[PDB]
Amino acid sequence: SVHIGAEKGQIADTVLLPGDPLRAKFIAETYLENVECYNEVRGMYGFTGTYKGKKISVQGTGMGVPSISIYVNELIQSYDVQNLIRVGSCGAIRKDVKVRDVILAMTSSTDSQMNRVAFGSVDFAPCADFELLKNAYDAAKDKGVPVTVGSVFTADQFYNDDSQIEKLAKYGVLGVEMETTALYTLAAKHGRKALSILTVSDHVLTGEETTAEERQTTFHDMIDVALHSVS
Amino acid sequence: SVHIGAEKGQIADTVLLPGDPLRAKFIAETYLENVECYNEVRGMYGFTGTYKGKKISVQGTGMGVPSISIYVNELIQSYDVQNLIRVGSCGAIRKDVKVRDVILAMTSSTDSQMNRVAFGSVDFAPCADFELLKNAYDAAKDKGVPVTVGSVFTADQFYNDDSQIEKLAKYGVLGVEMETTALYTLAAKHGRKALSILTVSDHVLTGEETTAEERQTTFHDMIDVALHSVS
Amino acid sequence: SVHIGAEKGQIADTVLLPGDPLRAKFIAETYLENVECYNEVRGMYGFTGTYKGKKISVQGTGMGVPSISIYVNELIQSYDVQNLIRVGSCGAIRKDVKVRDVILAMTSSTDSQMNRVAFGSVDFAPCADFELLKNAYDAAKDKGVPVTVGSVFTADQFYNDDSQIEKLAKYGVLGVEMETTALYTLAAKHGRKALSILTVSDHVLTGEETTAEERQTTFHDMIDVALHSVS
Amino acid sequence: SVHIGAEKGQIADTVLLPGDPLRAKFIAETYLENVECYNEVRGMYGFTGTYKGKKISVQGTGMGVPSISIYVNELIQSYDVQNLIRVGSCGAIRKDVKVRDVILAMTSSTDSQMNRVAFGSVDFAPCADFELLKNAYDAAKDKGVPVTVGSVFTADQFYNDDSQIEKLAKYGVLGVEMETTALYTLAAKHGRKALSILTVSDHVLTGEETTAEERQTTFHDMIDVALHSVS
Amino acid sequence: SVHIGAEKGQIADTVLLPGDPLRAKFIAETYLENVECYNEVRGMYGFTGTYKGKKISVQGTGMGVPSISIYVNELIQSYDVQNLIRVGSCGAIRKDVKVRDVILAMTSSTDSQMNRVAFGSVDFAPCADFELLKNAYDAAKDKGVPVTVGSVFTADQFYNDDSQIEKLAKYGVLGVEMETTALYTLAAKHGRKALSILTVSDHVLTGEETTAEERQTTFHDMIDVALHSVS
Amino acid sequence: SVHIGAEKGQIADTVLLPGDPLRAKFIAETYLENVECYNEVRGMYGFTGTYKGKKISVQGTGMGVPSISIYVNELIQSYDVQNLIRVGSCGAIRKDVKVRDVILAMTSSTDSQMNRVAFGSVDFAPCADFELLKNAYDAAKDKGVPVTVGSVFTADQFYNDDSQIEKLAKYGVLGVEMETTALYTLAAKHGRKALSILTVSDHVLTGEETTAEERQTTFHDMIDVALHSVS
Numbered sequence A, B, C, D, E, F: 001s002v003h004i005g006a007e008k009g010q011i012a013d014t015v016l017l018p019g020d021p022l023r024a025k026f027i028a029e030t031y032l033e034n035v036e037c038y039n040e041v042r043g044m045y046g047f048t049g050t051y052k053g054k055k056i057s058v059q060g061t062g063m064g065v066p067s068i069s070i071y072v073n074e075l076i077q078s079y080d081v082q083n084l085i086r087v088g089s090c091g092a093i094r095k096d097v098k099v100r101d102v103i104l105a106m107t108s109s110t111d112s113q114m115n116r117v118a119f120g121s122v123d124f125a126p127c128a129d130f131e132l133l134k135n136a137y138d139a140a141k142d143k144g145v146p147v148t149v150g151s152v153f154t155a156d157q158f159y160n161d162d163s164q165i166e167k168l169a170k171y172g173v174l175g176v177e178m179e180t181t182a183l184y185t186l187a188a189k190h191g192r193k194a195l196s197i198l199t200v201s202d203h204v205l206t207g208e209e210t211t212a213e214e215r216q217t218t219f220h221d222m223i224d225v226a227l228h229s230v231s
C-alpha cells in the first residue's frame, strides 16, 4: 500500500490503533512478544508480535480524520485486517466523566465533512461493533476497571474558535478526540469490526489537567481492555 | 401538558413507546395488570398498569420525528419520565437482518434536519443508553431470542423518491424507521435513558414481506425484552 | 394502501385533512350526511359522507411533515384524490393576526429537510392551488368571515430551542403549524390541488391564549369555508 | 440613495419594475403622461408620470437577485415606496404554460443563497401581496386576458450547467426568471406590497421561441394588468 | 448572443469589464482610438477601439454575480474572448487598505451559491490568471502606482443584515464587491484568462468616504494598469 | 505548546513545512548547517539550522487539515513564526501539469468543513502571501526551473469514493494534496505569511507514475525555490 511498507501476512487480523507512533512502539515492546516492525514509512511505525500466543499488530495513525483514514483504508484493503481498535485519549467535556474512567465509544458526532461528502442531507451516525464493545466492557467489569459507555466527538480542529463542546456535553457527549468517526465509518463500509477505547487527557471546560501518574494508570487499563476485546 | 391529558403521578418512571396507539392499547391490556388509560387526547392513547408489581406506562407516539418529539418532550418535561423505550418495527435493508431478529439500536442516522437545526455543521450522532441496551441484550440472550445490535435510519419520508437506503445498507445500517433519532436525541438532551427495540416489517430492497405469524412472534419477543430492560 | 384500510371508491375526490382523527370524526358527524368510516388503521380515522348531495371525505393526518406525507401520498396514489384541504390551527406569530382571522396559506416556509433532500441547493417554495384558495377567499368574503391570506411556517419541532419565529414574523409570516409544506409539495408533485385553511390557536410570542369560545367559532368558520372551496 | 439620483417626492408610492432600463423608458413614454426622468445613474433609468391622474413610477432593476435587491432596498428605505410591481418575462418550463399566458407569481423557488444567508436551515418561501395579486387577477379576468397563477423559479445562472428546471416543472413551477425571490423577500421584510407579473419569453425545455408579435401583445397585456393592481 | 448585439469580430480578444455601462463609455472614449459601439441591448454598452494600435473592448457587466455571469458567458462562448479584466471598485474592509491602493485580486470569497450549486460540499476557490496578474503588478510597480495583492469578497447583498465582513477582514480579505467570484470561476471553466483590478470606494467599517478627487486618480491608475496586463 | 517540545527562540522566523517528518530530517541535514532537533514529540521532527548564515526551521506536519492545523497553530501562537512554507507533493489532475513542474499555489479549494464551520454560507477562499509567492516565482525563473502558478485542492480523503477531481480539473485546478487550505487560512487569520510549493507525485486520472529520478530532481528544485522565498 502507498503509506505502509509491509508485506503479505506481516500484519495481524487484529490491529491496535494509537495516534502516536512512539506509543505504538511503546505498546508493542511493553505488551507483546516476538515483535517485528513492519512499517517505518513517514516514521508512522507499525509492529506485529504475540499476546498469549496470538498475533496482534499495533499501528500509529497520526492525528485527525484524514490521517487515520489513510491507515485504516490501507489496513483493510491491502492487508485484510478484520478488527481495528483505536486506543487513545480524549478531552472530557463533562464533570461526570472521571479522570480514571475508560471510555468505550458507541458512536461519535463530528464536524468533519467526510460523511456529508458521501451522504449530503443525511446525518450518518457511525456505529461501534457491538461484539468488540461488549467484550471490552466485560473485560473491564471482570477486573473492576471503571468503564463508561457513550458517545464522543470527532473534531477536525484541536484549536477551534467555533467549538460546540458546551452544547455537545449537554446532549450527553463524553469527550472530544480526532479519529473515531473515520475509524467507525470506514470499518463498517468494508464489513470489518471497529471499536475506540479512550482515556481522559483533561477536562477541556475546566482546563483541569490529569496527572502523569493518572495517565500512566489509565493507559495500562486501556491496553489491558484492548487485549481482551476480540472474540 | 399540551398533548397529554394525564395528571401528576399517572405516568410511570418507565414508558414503552409504540408508534400506533391501538398497539399501545394492545400492549397494556395483554401484558399489564390494573390498567388505567390516562390519555385520550387526539386518540393517542397512553396507559399505566403493573408488570410483576412494578408500574409501567405505554404511550402511542404517532409516526415521524415531529410526532414522537411532542410526546417525548412532554413525558420528560411534564411527567418526569426516566426510561423511554420505543417498541416498533423497521424495514430491513440488509439480507443478514433476518425476519426473526430483534434489533437493539445503538444509534441512528437520519434525513431529519432536527439536529442540523441545533448544530449546523456538526453531524450529531444520537446514542442509546448503554444500561438499557445491555439489559435488553441480556434478557434476549437469556431466553435465546435472536438479537442483533447495530444502527438504524430515521426517515422523514416513508415514500422517498431520493432514498439512500442502498448506500446506508453498505455502510452497515440495519433498517429504516421514523422515530429513533428524535427519541435518542431528546432523551439525552434531558439526561433521561432511551432505547429503541425493533422488529422487521419487511425487506424493503427485496419487497419480501414478513408473514402475520412471524410478525406476531417477533412482536411478543420485543415486548418481553422491553419488560426486562430497566435496572 | 399501507396505512389506510379503504376500498376502491370509498374515498371522495375531495378530502378535508384535520391533524386530529377525533376532529375528523367530529367534522364528518357534525357536517355530513350518510357517513361511513372507511379507515380505522392506527385509529387515524377517515370518513366519507355528503354535503349538499356531493361526496366529501375527512381524513386525520397526525402531526408533522412525515405523518401527513404518508396520508397525502396514499390518498393521491392509491385513491386518486383530486382536492386536498387541510383544516387545522397554527400559532400566530404576529399581533396583526387576530384571534378570529381565518388564514388561507399561499405558501409555507419550513425547517423540514424534505425539499433539500430532493433539491439540494434549491429553496423550493410550495404553492397553494390558486383556484381552491380563491374559492375559499370568495366564500369567506361572501359571508363576512374575516380572512387573511399569506404565508405560514411548517415546523418539525413543536418545542424548538432554536426557533426563528421572531425573524419569520418580521418577514411577514403569519403563524406556525406542522403540515403545510408537505401537503403543498406532495400535491403539486402529483398534479393535484391543495389548500391549507387555518385558525389561530394562540399568540406564541405573547403566550396569550385563545378562549374555548373563540376556538369553537373559528373552527366552524374554517369548516364552512372549506365546504365551499372546490369548483 | 447610493444608486438612485432622485430627490424627495420624485418617486411615486407605486413603482413598476422592469429588468431592462430601456423598457422602463418605453413603458413610461408609451403609457404615462407628464413624465420626468428622476434617475440616470448607471443608465438604470427611473421615471415618474401619471396614469389616469395618479402618480406612477417605472424603475429598471438590472438582471439578477443582487441587482434588483439594490434598487428595491433603496426605493423602500430612501423613497418610502409602498407598492412594488415587477413587470418582466420568464422562460416557461411547462407545456401547459401557453405563450399568451400572463403569469401572476404567488411565490418563487430559488438557487440564490440570499435567504439561507439569513435563515440557515430554514427554507424561506417568499410570498406575493395577496391584495395586489387579486387586483391583477381581477383586472385580467375583467378584460379576458388569459392569466395563470402559480410559482416561478428565481435563478442566479441564466446559463446553468446544473439546472433543475426539469424537476421544478414536475413540482408545478411555471417558469424561470432572475428577480422574484429578492423582490418578494425584501418587500415583506419591510412591510411593503409586492407582485411579479410575467410574460413568456420562450419554452426553455423545447427551445421553442415566442414570436415578436406574441411578445408585443403579451407585453401590453402585462402593463395593462399592472396599471390596475393597486387598490 | 442573447444579451449582446454584436457581430463576428466586433469584440476584441481582450475585454475590460466595468460594472457601470456609462463607465464603459467613458473608458472607451477617454482611452481608445477609433471607437465603435457594438452593443446597446439593455443599455449595457460595449465598445471596441484601439490602444497603441491594438484592438481592445470595454463591456459593462451590471451589478452582481448573475449579471456579470450573463456577459462573461456570452463574451466567451459567442465571441471567443481570451482575456477578461474587470475594472471596478470595492469597499475596503481593512485599515491597511489605503484609499489610493490599486487592488489585484488573487482570489475571492463569496456568499453566492453559484459554486455550491456545482460542487456541493466542496468550497471552490476561484483563481486569477497569474500571467495577467503579474503583468498588472509589473505595470504598477514600473510607474510607482501603489498596488496591493490579495483577496476580495463577492457579495450578493450590497445591503446585508447578516454581513460577515468583520470576520472576513480578520482573515485578511481586503474589500467587498459583487463580481469577482463569477468572472474568475467562469473564465477558468472555459480556459480563458481573467483578472480583477479594483479601486477603493470607501472604508465600509468606518463609513469614511473616499473623495471625488481620490476616486478620479485611482480610476485612472486602474485603467492604466489594465491597459498593460495582456502579454 | 501541546505538540511541540521546543523552547523559546529554538524555532526560526521562517519554517519549511513538509508533511513527512523523515523528509523534515532529510531537508535539514542535506541543506542546512549547524542543525539542532528541537522536537521529537510523536516523532514529528522539527529542526533548526542556518542557510547562508540565516536561521531556518523545518517542521513535519503530518497528513491532512487537522494535523497541519495543530502544528501551524502552535508555531504561530507559541513560537511567533512569521513565514510558513509548505514543501510537499500533490497528485496532478491535468495533462498540462507536467511531471517536472514546480507548483506555486495561489489558493486552494477543499472538501474540508473547516471554513464552513467558521463562515457557514460563505465560501472562504484562502490566499497565499503574494510577497512569498512572487519571491519563489522569481527564484524559479532566475534559474530556469519550470514553474506553474495556480490553484490546488485540499482533500480530506486520500481514498475518496465521491471525488470531484474530474470537475475540479475542468475548472483549472492543478492538483490534489491535503494541507494547503489549513495553512493558508490559519496563517492569514493570524497575520502571518504562507505559501505552498508542490511537486507532482503522479497523474491521478491517468494513474501514470512519476519516476524516482524525476521525484528526486523536482524535490531538490522545490527546496531550492523555498530557500529563496523570504524577503
Ligand SMILES: Nc1nc2c(ncn2COC(CO)CO)c(=O)[nH]1
Pocket: A019, A062, A063, A064, A088, A089, A090, A091, A092, A155, A157, A158, A176, A177, A178, A179, A201, A202, A204
Ligand atoms: N481535539 C482534541 N483532541 C484530544 C483532546 N485530548 C486528547 N485528544 C486526542 O488527541 C488528539 C491529538 O492531540 C487527537 O489524536 C482534546 O482535548 N481535544
Ligand SMILES: Nc1nc2c(ncn2COC(CO)CO)c(=O)[nH]1
Pocket: B019, B062, B063, B064, B088, B089, B090, B091, B092, B155, B157, B158, B176, B177, B178, B179, B201, B202, B204
Ligand atoms: N420509513 C419506513 N418506516 C418503517 C418501515 N417498516 C416499519 N417502519 C416503521 O413504521 C413507520 C410507519 O409505517 C414509522 O412509525 C419501512 O419500510 N420504512
Ligand SMILES: Nc1nc2c(ncn2COC(CO)CO)c(=O)[nH]1
Pocket: C019, C062, C063, C064, C088, C089, C090, C091, C092, C155, C157, C158, C176, C177, C178, C179, C201, C202, C204
Ligand atoms: N408548532 C406549532 N404548531 C401548532 C401551534 N398551534 C397550532 N399548531 C398546529 O398543531 C400542531 C400540533 O399541536 C400540528 O398539528 C404552535 O403554536 N406551534
Ligand SMILES: Nc1nc2c(ncn2COC(CO)CO)c(=O)[nH]1
Pocket: D019, D062, D063, D064, D088, D089, D090, D091, D092, D155, D157, D158, D176, D177, D178, D179, D201, D202, D204
Ligand atoms: N434565467 C432565465 N431568465 C429569463 C428567461 N426568460 C426570461 N428571463 C428573464 O430575463 C432575465 C434576463 O435575460 C432576467 O432578467 C430564461 O429562459 N431563463
Ligand SMILES: Nc1nc2c(ncn2COC(CO)CO)c(=O)[nH]1
Pocket: E019, E062, E063, E064, E088, E089, E090, E091, E092, E155, E157, E158, E176, E177, E178, E179, E201, E202, E204
Ligand atoms: N457590496 C459592495 N460593493 C461595492 C462596495 N463598494 C464598491 N462596490 C462595487 O460596486 C457594486 C455596486 O455598487 C458592485 O458592482 C461596497 O462597499 N459593497
Ligand SMILES: Nc1nc2c(ncn2COC(CO)CO)c(=O)[nH]1
Pocket: F019, F062, F063, F064, F088, F089, F090, F091, F092, F155, F157, F158, F176, F177, F178, F179, F201, F202, F204
Ligand atoms: N489526496 C492526495 N494527496 C496527495 C497526492 N499526491 C501527493 N499528495 C500529498 O501527500 C498526501 C499524503 O499521501 C498529503 O500529505 C494524491 O494523489 N492525492
Ligand SMILES: [Cl-]
Pocket: A004, A005, A006, A038, A039, A040, A041
Ligand atoms: Cl517500511
Ligand SMILES: [Cl-]
Pocket: A053, A054, A055
Ligand atoms: Cl494468531
Ligand SMILES: [Cl-]
Pocket: A018, A019, A020, A087, A088, A089, A090, A177
Ligand atoms: Cl489520541
Ligand SMILES: [Cl-]
Pocket: A155, A157, A160, A163, A164, A165, A176
Ligand atoms: Cl471542537
Ligand SMILES: [Cl-]
Pocket: A163, A164, A165, A166, A167, A168
Ligand atoms: Cl456550544
Ligand SMILES: [Cl-]
Pocket: B004, B005, B006, B038, B039, B040, B041
Ligand atoms: Cl385525556
Ligand SMILES: [Cl-]
Pocket: B053, B054, B055
Ligand atoms: Cl413501581
Ligand SMILES: [Cl-]
Pocket: B018, B019, B020, B087, B088, B089, B090, B177
Ligand atoms: Cl413503528
Ligand SMILES: [Cl-]
Pocket: B155, B157, B160, B163, B164, B165, B176
Ligand atoms: Cl428513506
Ligand SMILES: [Cl-]
Pocket: B163, B164, B165, B166, B167, B168
Ligand atoms: Cl443509495
